[PDB]
Amino acid sequence: PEIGEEVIEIKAAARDPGSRAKIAVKTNDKRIDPVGACVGMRGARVQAVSTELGGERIDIVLWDDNPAQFVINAMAPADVASIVVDEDKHTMDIAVEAGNLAQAIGRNGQNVRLASQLSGWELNVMTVDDLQAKHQAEAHAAIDTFTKYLDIDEDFATVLVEEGFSTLEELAYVPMKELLEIEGLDEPTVEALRERAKNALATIAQAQEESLGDNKPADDLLNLEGVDRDLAFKLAARGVCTLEDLAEQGIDDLADIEGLTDEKAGALIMAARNICWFGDEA
Amino acid sequence: ARVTVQDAVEKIGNRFDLVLVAARRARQMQVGGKDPLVPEENDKTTVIALREIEEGLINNQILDVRERQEQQEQEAAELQAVTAIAEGRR
Numbered sequence: 001p002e003i004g005e006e007v008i009e010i011k012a013a014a015r016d017p018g019s020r021a022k023i024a025v026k027t028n029d030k031r032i033d034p035v036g037a038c039v040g041m042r043g044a045r046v047q048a049v050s051t052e053l054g055g056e057r058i059d060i061v062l063w064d065d066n067p068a069q070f071v072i073n074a075m076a077p078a079d080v081a082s083i084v085v086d087e088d089k090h091t092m093d094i095a096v097e098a099g100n101l102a103q104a105i106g107r108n109g110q111n112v113r114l115a116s117q118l119s120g121w122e123l124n125v126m127t128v129d130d131l132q133a134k135h136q137a138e139a140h141a142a143i144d145t146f147t148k149y150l151d152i153d154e155d156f157a158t159v160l161v162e163e164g165f166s167t168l169e170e171l172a173y174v175p176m177k178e179l180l181e182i183e184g185l186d187e188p189t190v191e192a193l194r195e196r197a198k199n200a201l202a203t204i205a206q207a208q209e210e211s212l213g214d215n216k217p218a219d220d221l222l223n224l225e226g227v228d229r230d231l232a233f234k235l236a237a238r239g240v241c242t243l244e245d246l247a248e249q250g251i252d253d254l255a256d257i258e259g260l261t262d263e264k265a266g267a268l269i270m271a272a273r274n275i276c277w278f279g280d281e282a
Numbered sequence: 283a284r285v286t287v288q289d290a291v292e293k294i295g296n297r298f299d300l301v302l303v304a305a306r307r308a309r310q311m312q313v314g315g316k317d318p319l320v321p322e323e324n325d326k327t328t329v330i331a332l333r334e335i336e337e338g339l340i341n342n343q344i345l346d347v348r349e350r351q352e353q354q355e356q357e358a359a360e361l362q363a364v365t366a367i368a369e370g371r372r
Contacts, residue, residue: 018370055371 008034011063011070014117020106021056022114024074026063035060059111067119068092074118078104081128087165093124095131142167149200151192156184220279221246224272234259235269243276283323290335300335303342307331310345 002008009028015021023046025034039046039060050056061076068085071092078100084093096104105112105125115123126134139162146157149168160179161167172193180186211233220243221232237257240246251265268274287300294300308327310316320333334340 057371 002030002032002034002037006030007032008037010038012074012118014114015053015056015058016106016108016110016114017053018055019057019108020110020114021050021053021058022061022074022076022111022118023058024061024063024070024076024118026065035062059114061118063118067121071115071119071121071123074115075104075123082131090121092119092121093126095126095128097127101125101127145169149196150189151196152186152189153184156182220276221272224275226271226275227269230259231264232272235264235272243273246273246276283325284329284332284336287332287335290332293335293338294341299342303340303345304328304331304335306345307334307340 003010006028007030009026011024011026013021013023015023023038025038027034043058043060046058046060050058059077062073064070064073067090072080072083075094078096080094082095085091103111109116112123112125139158142161142164143154143158145168146152146161146164147154150157150171152160156179159182163178164171164174164176166174215236217229217232217236218241221227221236222229224232227235234257235246235254238249238254238260240249246269249265251262254260254265255262264270268277290300291297294303308331311318311327311331318330318334319339320330320337322330322333331340
């Protein structure tokens with residue numbers, strides 16, 4: 001009854017019947033305990049609703065205004081030692097052991113999706129030792145990325161990318177003046193970063209090269225009715241070169257290329273192999 | 283396709299006990315059906331059990347003990363269901 005009067009607000013309610021369910025609630029500016037009011041005595045409301053659903057494991061959780069605290073409260077019931085967040089993209093990451101990861105995830109993600117439906121963002125689960133190993137690997141990879149995309153010295157690049165969020169990927173928009181506070185001079189580093197941008201343009205040209213020079217589809221596949229250039233390229237990416245090669249290829253062999261579907265592998269291919277075979281007849 | 287059960291009577295001396303055994307066998311055969319243990323000839327259940335008697339691979343003991351193992355298997359299904367109850371809730 002407090003939902004209508006705005007005494008307490010139901011922030012989110014996700015329910016996998018029987019397996020797991022999470023209801024996160026918050027007070028709509030009333031300074032009242034939402035979970036303690038909506039749960040009753042030892043969950044006598046949530047337990048009754050679960051018994052109506054037929055044995056659901058329902059968990060009442062808190063909720064806050066900001067999305068970071070919302071996700072932190074939607075990861076309940078657990079204990080959090082540390083949590084990593086991103087300011088640009090609304091994403092959250094937490095670390096827990098396998099014994100806790102099994103309970104926080106669920107058999108089919110029923111609890112985890114309950115968090116996913118609560119915060120609205122994708123979640124990632126990893127171990128604490130795995131977190132430290134990933135931190136060391138990310139430090140090394142960020143040093144390499146700062147050396148490659150910003151074109152600076154590696155010893156200073158490691159220290160800069162340790163503090164820099166999104167170390168080197170279109171990072172000129174982010175404030176790079178924090179790297180000037182470190183020792184050393186970077187006067188030619190601006191020209192080096194311009195050269196790195198030219199190298200990125202060359203990488204775009206290399207993607208165009210992979211599109212054009214790297215095993216382009218023939219005229220028979222491109223001129224087939226009902227199939228576009230992308231469809232012909234997807235059909236030919238499965239090792240086929242001629243009509244007989246297209247007939248020899250199967251659905252499983254063509255499934256490696258994401259551009260080609262099972263219907264595209266259906267009968268001849270879908271239309272293209274039939275057109276290439278029957279081009280002799282009018 | 284069979285006209286005499288005298289061979290069956292030879293296998294099990296008491297005729298009435300043979301009648302009970304055949305009746306129980308065919309009762310299991312019709313409802314809760316089990317596969318025949320002899321290639322039948324589009325025949326009724328009344329004679330196929332008698333054919334099973336003809337091979338001598340059927341008596342009171344065989345059916346009783348076989349039903350005991352089948353009951354134990356049903357109980358094992360009950361226990362595995364019980365074990366699947368505990369994990370589902372907790």
